[PDB]
Point group: D2
Chain length 125, copies 4
């Protein structure tokens, strides 16, 4: 019932070799799992997020975002990443994102708490 519900739902892979498994709900919900190929991470982590379920029809992408807190049954990296981006449909469908990864720190170390980067997700690798 959301415009790109089918387009977004499924398995995505980024340039680092990480795996993003998501279900898009009719209501705008994103739920799934994230497995990072890098960093202080092992196996799957819960993710949740939101997307625009009624995007513009003028060729614009579909805005979305999601969060992973880096705690699961195996490890806790005392940190959380949020990806903010847009889904672009078509033959080479993509989710183009920028992300913010904040670590829990002391107040004295808060200036160095947050990494920033960019991930591009595709349906194939």
């Amino acid at each position: 019932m959301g415009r790109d519900e089918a387009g977004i739902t499924g398995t995505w892979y980024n340039q680092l070799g990480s795996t993003f498994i998501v279900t898009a709900g009719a209501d705008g919900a994103l739920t799934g799992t994230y497995e990072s190929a890098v960093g202080n991470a092992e196996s799957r982590y819960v993710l949740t997020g939101r997307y625009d379920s009624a995007p513009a029809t003028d060729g614009s992408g579909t805005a979305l975002g999601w969060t992973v807190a880096w705690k699961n049954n195996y490890r806790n990296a005392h940190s959380a990443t949020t990806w903010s981006g847009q889904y672009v449909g078509g033959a080479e469908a993509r989710i183009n994102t920028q992300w913010l990864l904040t670590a829990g720190t002391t107040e004295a170390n808060a200036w160095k708490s947050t990494l920033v980067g960019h991930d591009t997700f595709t349906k194939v690798k």
Copy 2:
């Protein structure tokens, strides 16, 4: 059952006068509503996110993040914000965040799709 479940759960206010209403689950879930005092927004929007439910005990903050897609029954701003940050407990409890706000754009306009900023949330105003 999460360490800062009680600390995080409730109503928070930022420097712009926005209102963030959240429930923290034992499992690491964040669910609630966001009302922005600024921008192309009216009333409450659904949010979801994650937090570290077993933070370090060395005085470090608690990593968390959440997403709002700016669609509700009143408006659709074809955009999504993610906040990434940490909760700092104590007498003047705070959630210190940085955020990324991505708009759905054409591919030609994607270079100007994403705003970045920083919000500090407190329990009082």
Copy 3:
């Protein structure tokens, strides 16, 4: 000859206790020194940057930015910070910035190369 040449030129202090000493040129140049109160840094480092020497007259701030590479005669932290922001004049003059601090890394570690934060500079402390 630039509108805020006099306003910008001088000594500024941020929330971390760092010291930013700058001269604004008529042509839009920023030159000076930066001393960080935190991180892998000691004493003064060269900075250079640019500002809008003919800002809007509608109450808007003055856009500017500058760079420090963290090499001087004492230390080399193999990294560079850029601050991007605006100068806001008046009785409590401020330079409000966001910054990106990139470390030289191997290609395998490039995903974790860049910190992001925000500094507010004032004329007094």
Copy 4:
């Protein structure tokens, strides 16, 4: 006399078709011109910046950054971009950056003052 003085100096092109012309000084200076293929920009703009003139010899990139204020003899976009990144040498030499583009705004509009993105520069197109 700087390790990558020769490597950095010259003409670079990004994924948008913008042109970055830079001279790297022995002392860590970057000077040159920037021509954007997009946005409120026409012709060349002055840039200045800094780079690590004595990088690590362990295969790490070379940290650098620079600023453009978007005022020249043709236009004034009341804004400034800073790029923060690293130079990676070799057969396919690259400068991989993230950037912050701040517009001069009123205090009421400062929350929406800053765009963030990422540019990759190469020696060929």
